[PDB]
Amino acid sequence: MDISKPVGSEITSVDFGILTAKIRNLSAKQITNPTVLDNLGHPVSGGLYDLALGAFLRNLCSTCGLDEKFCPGHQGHIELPVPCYNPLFFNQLYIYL
Amino acid sequence: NLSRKLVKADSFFMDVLVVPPTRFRLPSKLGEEVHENSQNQLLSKVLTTSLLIRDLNDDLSKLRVIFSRLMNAFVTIQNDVNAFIDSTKAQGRTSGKVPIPGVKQALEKKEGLFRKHMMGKRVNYAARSVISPDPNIETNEIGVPPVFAVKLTYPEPVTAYNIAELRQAVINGPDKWPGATQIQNEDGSLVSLIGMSVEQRKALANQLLTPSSNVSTHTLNKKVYRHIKNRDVVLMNRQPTLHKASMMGHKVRVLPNEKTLRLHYANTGAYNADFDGDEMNMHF
Amino acid sequence: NENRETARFIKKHKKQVTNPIDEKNGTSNCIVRVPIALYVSLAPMYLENPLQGVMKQHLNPLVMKYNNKVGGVVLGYEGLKILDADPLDTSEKLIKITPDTPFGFTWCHVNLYVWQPQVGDVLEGYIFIQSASHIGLLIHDAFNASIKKNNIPVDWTFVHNDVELGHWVDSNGEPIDGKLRFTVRNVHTTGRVVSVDGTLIS
Amino acid sequence: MYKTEKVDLALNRNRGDPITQHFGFGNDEWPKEWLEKLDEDGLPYIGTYVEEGDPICAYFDDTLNKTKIKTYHSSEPAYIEEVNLIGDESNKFQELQTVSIKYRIRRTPQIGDKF
Amino acid sequence: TTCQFLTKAVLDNEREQLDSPSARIVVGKLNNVGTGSFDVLAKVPNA
Amino acid sequence: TFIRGPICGTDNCPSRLWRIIDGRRTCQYGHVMEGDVEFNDDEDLGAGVITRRLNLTTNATGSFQSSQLTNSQLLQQQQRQSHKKFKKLIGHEAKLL
Amino acid sequence: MMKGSRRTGNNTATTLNTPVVIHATQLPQHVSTDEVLQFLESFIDEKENTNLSSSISQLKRIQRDFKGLP
Amino acid sequence: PEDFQQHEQIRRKTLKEKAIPKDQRATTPYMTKYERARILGTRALQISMNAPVFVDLEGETDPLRIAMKELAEKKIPLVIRRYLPDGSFEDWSVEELIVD
Amino acid sequence: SAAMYSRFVKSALDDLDKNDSTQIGIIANQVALPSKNPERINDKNLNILLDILSSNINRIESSRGTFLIQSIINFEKWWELPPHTLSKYIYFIKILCSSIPKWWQDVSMILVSCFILPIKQTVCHHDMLKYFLRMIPSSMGFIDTYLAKFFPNKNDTRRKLVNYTSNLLKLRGYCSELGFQIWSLLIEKIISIDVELQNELDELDDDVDDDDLEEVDLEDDDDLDDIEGMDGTEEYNVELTQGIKELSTKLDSILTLVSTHVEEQVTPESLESGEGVGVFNTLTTLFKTHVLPTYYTRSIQYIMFHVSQQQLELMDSFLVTLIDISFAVNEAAEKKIKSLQYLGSYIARAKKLSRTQIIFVASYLTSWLNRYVIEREEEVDQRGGMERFKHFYAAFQALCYIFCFRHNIFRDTDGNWECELDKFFQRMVISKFNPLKFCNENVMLMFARIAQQESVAYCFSIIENNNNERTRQQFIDLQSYFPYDPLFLKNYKILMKEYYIEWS
Amino acid sequence: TLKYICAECSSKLSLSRTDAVRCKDCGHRILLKARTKRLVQFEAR
Amino acid sequence: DRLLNSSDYTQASVCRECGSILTTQQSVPRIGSISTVCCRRCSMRFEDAKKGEKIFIDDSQIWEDGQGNKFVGGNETTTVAIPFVLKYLDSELSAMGIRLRYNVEPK
Ligand SMILES: [Zn+2]
Question: Integer distance in angstroms from the first to the last C-alpha of chain K?
Fold first, then answer.
């Protein structure tokens, strides 16, 4: 904390809620390759260390274009083809079923 | 519901996932070898089974056993995303010592996330040491060794009244006790005073009140990170903090030729402290 | 059904106020006064003179620069009033110091006088230079305007100067003066220099 | 107080893996002042006062083509009391790749110690 | 039981008003007891 | 003492930098760079359960830069059989000797 | 690179520089040139009783542009 | 511009319903030891950022001891807003509170 | 080949209408080769490639054509083209930025970053830069940060600073709205070199340089001609050495050239309607904001000494400015003791000051000390030690600093002292404040060996008395410091020999 | 002058390249390193 | 001080419109442009020109990310002071499909 850097905005309240299946407007990474790495250590396109998900191993991120210490990281999504149920909310779907 | 939304059925089924960013999934090494992250090991097992079913839907559509190969795959793509979030939900191998605790067990324990990294944290600018008796310090004071005194620093903003004291802290530098270790410029950039000598530090010390050419940061002034002096204060502590008099605001007296923190006898009943090798946490 | 779900997006990009003409001379009035409400910080050094602290920190870096919330180039400001943090007009107001830092924060009203060109607006401008690619102009002796040759009529040509560049000849045979009336095609904020893109044709 | 660290260069090397790393100094890859604490065989002179961050033995590996040191990582300074070196018996007739080194850490009674 | 009250808070669509001292530490807010039970405001002289 | 990393900013020079309190790195002239992370996980053979084992190695005070496969193997097995001599796989040679 | 590093040096958008939010509160109502000549008299001559030197260099052109000819 | 003026109108009228006037304020006329600790901490955090100080400092270089010298001479230009748990407030000044 | 390639680069621009961007990556890649690499484009096809671009600028502006423009930007040594190829490249930059003023963000970078060269090289760098200062008024802003980003670092060679600061006061003489931001950048980064040198100076008694001859070294340079994948963690011989004999020469170079350039600016014909009012006012504000809060800084406040003595009115505009600071009731205590310290050393060590201006400072300085005679002289046996009167203990010392150096202006042949100093001092010495004990040991004893001789006041029985009676270190040292001691710099004192009074 | 010592027979010993780690008199595998005339300094305290 | 300031104080960027931390991103600018903070899921991409009587996007609502996908909108982000573990909570909660909406009402 530096006292020379004030912050004007602050959080009043937090709403809980459920992410709908329109992560498509959020996430344009689409992580589909189950292979993660290859020979000579470059992260594979589509794999779980995709460079659109943040900078990694002195590279630059494919989304924000910043290095390892300036990038926030970004959220990619795995398309499930079939609607597997949410295991938190199973006890309450089995009530309304 | 002032947004007048609709309770939809898709809230209970996961059409997709999200994958946390790479910084939250960096490779979890141990010893002196790098290993793959745990949260990818049950997120690849989801992703091979989403690749098995992607081919077998094309196998059916170009025209049996193709349904028993498909319904058995739904047994495990449900169970792998079950094992991804919870871990006590999924049976799986059932040999014992289940790997990849999943995103619930990262939150629920005594440790979890919500009691080891939110309700309790680890702090900067703190020290701990064995305490030792002293009747020559005050009752509201602590005896700070010169080991801690040349480390714990305070960002003192330089002004017109402290410039006589903060020039000497830059000229003393990191070596002498009544000294500094860093100066912070008005652009936020630090200048360490460690590798310099007396002539670099005596030059800089005369530049603490020179205004910057930059106008976006004209409000600011510099900040000397002076060492901890005799006018600072300090929170002391002990390991069972059972009441609030086990954490109190001692003033600082820096005592030379000492290697332990040093405490008066009037505080020995408030911290429930006996001088037999107890350590006290010191917060600045 | 998208006539209410997406109609805010149209209201987001519907222009609020359009630019009309003055004295029947074609030149669309792009200079306008918009009243705004700011949420600004205040230093402890201007805690004896708080109106100078809002002006020098927040409002003086805001003139002659494009502002995204008002859509024009701010030409200044007038009538600054700090809003009091107490509903009690007077001098001895009070602002609210933050808990972390020593800075305060406050709401302010001020009347900006922004210069607001939009598409289909008609403007003057002195011709600065002219090659066989484009004409560059200064609208109101301040603002870069680039009328390019694809937007210039075909029925005009480009005489070329001898040693020093080249002049311009219209249909009338007139060597044209600087004072040229055109229509805004696009307004570029690609950099810290406001670029007006224009056409001569209708 | 005495302490022994075992330096075992056969540690990460696999069972069928040939010998990569060798004690001593590789040639023409030369940081100086490593010769202050160490002998020509990549083993420390005994009696040497070692602080933290000092080279405690140097080797040369072939998968990196670099001469690298092992670092004394202990806050207490020490000396070198002994350097033993252990010959192979399971896979014989090879050179030294197990060295045990004994320190001594002197203990004057400090304020805080318990009698 | 972190992820049973979390399930109950999401099904309820419950707005955390962030006023218990265990809620403010999560969101990183000044606590509302003692020195945080009021506000300091600065009486500035000029209009 | 001065290890390699990225280059120094502040229009100072391109250089290598220097630690301060073992996890932040400063240049040779005092100026400080932004926050090296030092990935760690603690202890208590043991320490839980063994999951997997792959070939990467942390060597860059934080993230890793080692053990990338066969960037040197092309020049590994063409330097192994030059050190020892005189293999006696001899043709027209030794007619001489 | 040397013009790719230190991204915050070109940012200059801290809360001591930029206001947090700006909201218009009415609609922008069009002004007369006899106000623009009146405002730029009373604004330029009031700011000249230290930044703001390069901006008044631009307002002196615009003030003269509504009344003169270079 | 129409929603904001309606939002501003609510925001300042709600904040005027929560203000208690100077005659109807019923809290204590003393400075409740958590006010004195935050007034001195906030004023001294301003004095360290070059605030205009209204006291003759005799070579005191601690910012917190300078604020303790303004409190003794009733020279701190601050106002305490005392919140009641339904959100309403009372603005007490540092001048008229009784410092113990 | 003048007829051949005029199709090759006119149909290359058709290939940027054909929209595959192939020939862009070869033709503009050849110009991105250095000028030291002779396989580039020559001057021949540069007359040919560019005239395709100049009369057809509407057909380059695609975002894939960025490299077509990103190579013309780094076209190095464009300022050394032959004068009919030179005016053709300059004309392309004038029609690029008139078309799209997105690239003057990029081109103005390059002009400021090449003022390292002398004036004679950059006669065409300014006329491009001055063009888009007059054309583009929202370029006063971002170029002003480019002057602060690309100032030469202090570990550079000596010729960068003497020529950048020479080309930047060349800049100031054409854009006078940007001169307050010119002098604020010089004076701030002269102190950075200056203050590493007064510690380098010796003790209270200096030396002779042990040099019967001096070496300026015009030829102290080589020629102006001027990686594998990783380096490896390096090792010793940092050898962080300084040009201890070079920092004074840089300060010799810069601070004479500042005074050289300002002395052509200030003159009795620029105080009429030119930049005479502008520069002398922008330095006095910069005096009281930048140098006057630099603790213990010799050899920069001579620039204020230099301009003040070109005019008699530029003394009278600064003497009361020096008084307006040193007796401002609102300022801090150290901002007045240091200001009075600058008062007495300025009146004494100044050769061109008129005889009436010496006394009028001391007239007001005696007017302050006798208004003091009832208002605060009754507070001595009251409670509160002698630290309360440090403003009195400084203004007395500034008056006694003048009698040590300018006793012989106040006196006529008849002996009639001005303001009756022969009555004044011995009445102030016998006051309850005892101003011979609390002031500086040298200047009050230098007053003791003079006021006996010049027959004003006798005090060798009081300094004998005061030292027999026997918080403070910040006040001894603001009295020991003298702003106008003689100069460690040697090429700048040659100018100052006409301006500066020595010991005798 | 290269010097080790065998831990069994205390026979002083040199060890070159491509040698076994064995003593030459006895057949002993453990073999300890001697000390030479080299400067170390101590405050006599 | 002992929990936020001396442990994991960060000044994150939060969208005011959707109330999220992890959906924001600094934009990858035109070479004549200054980068700025933009929200991903509050942004409609530029090949959605839905047709004053015609609407043009105002040239400063258009930003681009690192690959080259153009977006429209995504502005109205602010700076708040949070701990860092609020981000690491909000990535563990999004993996559950749970969304947090931060109401940044001091505006
Ligand atoms: Zn630097």
Answer: 25
Greatest distance between any 2 Cα atoms in chain I? 103
Whether F49 sits inside 8 A of B99 (CB atoms) is yes
**Domain region containing C106:** 31-115
The pairing of beta strand K37-39 with beta strand K24-26? antiparallel
Angstrom distance (rounded) from CA C54 to CA G17:
10
* Subunits adjacent to chain I (3 or more Cβ pairs under 8 Å): B, C, D, F, G, H, K
Touching check for G22 and chain C: CB below 8 Å? Answer: yes
How far is residue A6 from each of residues C41, C101, F59, H64, measured CA to CA in Å? Answer: 8, 6, 38, 21
Please tell me the CATH code under which domain B152-228 is placed: 3.30.1490.180
I235 touches chain D (CB under 8 A): yes
Put simply, whether H26 touches A (Cβ < 8 Å) is: no
CB B118 within 8 A of CB E25: yes
Partner D, chain J 1-40, Cβ-Cβ below 8 Å:
2, 4, 7, 15, 17-22, 29-36, 38, 40
CB C125 within 8 A of CB C145: yes
Length of chain D: 115
CA of I193 to the centre of ligand 1 (A): 14
Domain of residue J21 covers 1-45
- SS3 call for C110: strand
Domains of chain K: 1-104 (3.90.1800.10)
Q: How far is F95 from chain A (nearest CA, A)?
A: 48
* CA I301/CA I284 separation, integer angstroms: 11
In chain J, how many domains are there? 1
Using the Cα atoms of residue I432, residue I433, residue I436 and residue I437 in order, give the sign of their dihedral: positive
Q: To one decimal place, what's the resolution in Å? A: 3.1
- H1-100: CATH class: alpha beta
- Experimental technique, in short, is cryo-EM
User: I218 CA distance to ligand 1 centroid (A)?
Assistant: 29
Spatial contact of B56 and B73, defined as CB atoms under 8 Å apart? yes
- DSSP for B2-49 reads TT-----GGGSEEEE--B--GGGG----BTTB----HHHHHHHHHHHH
- Separation CA I139–CA I111 (nearest Å): 13
The K62-64 sheet, strands edge to edge: K43-45, K70-73, K62-64
For chain G, the structural domain boundaries read 1-70
Q: Hey, where are the domains in chain H? A: 1-100
CA gap F66, F57 in Å, rounded: 5
Task: Look up residue B282 and give its two tokens.
Answer: 């010191």
Q: B125-151+229-284 belongs to which CATH class?
A: mainly beta
Closest CA to B217 of G13, C38, I467: G13
Cα(K76)–Cα(C12) distance, integer angstroms? 13
Contact (Cβ atoms closer than 8 angstroms) between residue H77 and residue E43? yes
